[PDB]
């Protein structure tokens, strides 16, 4: 099961929804992540150039796929196969972003 | 502002999330729609051909846009400029569907 996050499009893309697999993968309950930017999943071993490519894609509302080192709540690393896409209305306004997280550590 | 719905991919695509604008447009609170298929928004004057196109698109996980007649909680009809797309993982498994609703 892949984790899924939904964020607001604007401000700092706060998380507005996670699926159950999100909590299985990351160790966080919904109430611990709602209203936060997903960057709290990163740590000192996360690749800064990868974070930069996500930052620039989100600012432009461009879809992006990266493999990124992330951390469970208890501190265990997992390699996150992350896919992020904007949700657009028919005028092209960005309504939200959706993220799909696959734990590809094994 | 455009309404947004997120559903599960499987079974009968039950609604798992709605934004604030969904409630403004439809007059339903989240508690009233969570766990339900969004077809409850349709009613007597809804075009059956339009429903059938949405049904086939969801079954194949194909993106689709339709203008569909829907009904607010209080029974007032409204034109829903609806666009539906699947959310996929990187192996192409469908994880969810996203619907965007504009009252036109
Ligand atoms: C919908 C969505 C989901 C995201 N999921 C993750 C994630 O699972 N792991 C992660 O490291 N970053 C994730 N991000 C990226 C961070 O939120 C952030 O955009 C990234 O760290 C780049 O921005 P920054 O330099 O301001 O931190 C996600 C962003 C969005 C919009
Ligand atoms: C994410 C999502 C959002 C939807 N939103 C609406 C909507 O706003 N109004 C509507 O009439 N149908 C909506 N539908 C369509 C119905 O849920 C259903 O797929 C359609 O009526 C055709 O299938 P049926 O013949 O089994 O009812 C949505 C479906 C999905 C998957």
Author numbering:
A (entry chain A): 48 to 153
B (entry chain B): 48 to 151
Recite the paper's sentences:
Flavin-binding fluorescent proteins (FbFPs), engineered from prokaryotic and eukaryotic light, oxygen, voltage (LOV) photoreceptors, are promising fluorescent reporter proteins. Their small size (about 10 kDa for monomeric FbFPs such as the improved LOV (iLOV) protein derived from Arabidopsis thaliana phototropin photoreceptors) and their oxygen-independent fluorescence make them ideal reporters to monitor transport and anaerobic biological processes. In contrast to GFP-like fluorescent reporter proteins, whose absorption and fluorescence maxima can be tuned by exchanging certain chromophore-constituting amino acids, the absorption and fluorescence of FbFPs and other flavoproteins depends on noncovalently bound flavins, whose structure cannot be influenced by mutation. Using spectroscopy, X-ray crystallography, and quantum mechanics molecular mechanics calculations, we provide a firm structural and functional understanding of spectral tuning in FbFPs.
To verify the transferability of the mutation, we introduced the corresponding I52T mutation into CagFbFP–Q148K. The resulting purified protein showed very similar spectral properties as iLOV–V392T–Q489K, that is, basically no shift in the absorption maximum relative to parental CagFbFP (compare solid red line and gray dashed line) and a 7-nm red-shifted fluorescence-emission maximum (compare gray dashed line and solid red line). We readily obtained orthorhombic crystals for CagFbFP–I52T–Q148K (space group P21212, two molecules per asymmetric units) that diffracted up to 1.8 Å. Compared with the blue-shifted iLOV–Q489K and CagFbFP–Q148K variants, the red-shifted double variant shows a closed FMN binding pocket with no unlatched C terminus (C-α atom core RMSD: 0.48 Å with 102 aligned residues). The introduced threonine (T52) shows two conformations in both subunits, one with the side-chain oxygen facing toward G146 and a second one with the side-chain oxygen facing toward F69 (approximate occupancies of the two conformations are 65% and 35%, respectively). K489 adopts one major conformation in both subunits (approximate occupancy 65%) in which the side chain extends toward the introduced T52 and the FMN moiety. Interactions between both threonine conformations and the lysine are feasible with interatomic distances between the lysine NZ atom and the threonine side-chain oxygen of 2.5 Å or 2.6 Å in both subunits. It is remarkable that the double mutation (CagFbFP–I52T–Q148K) forces the lysine into a new conformation by hydrogen bonding with threonine, thus preventing the bending of the C terminus, which restores a nearly “native” closed LOV-core conformation.
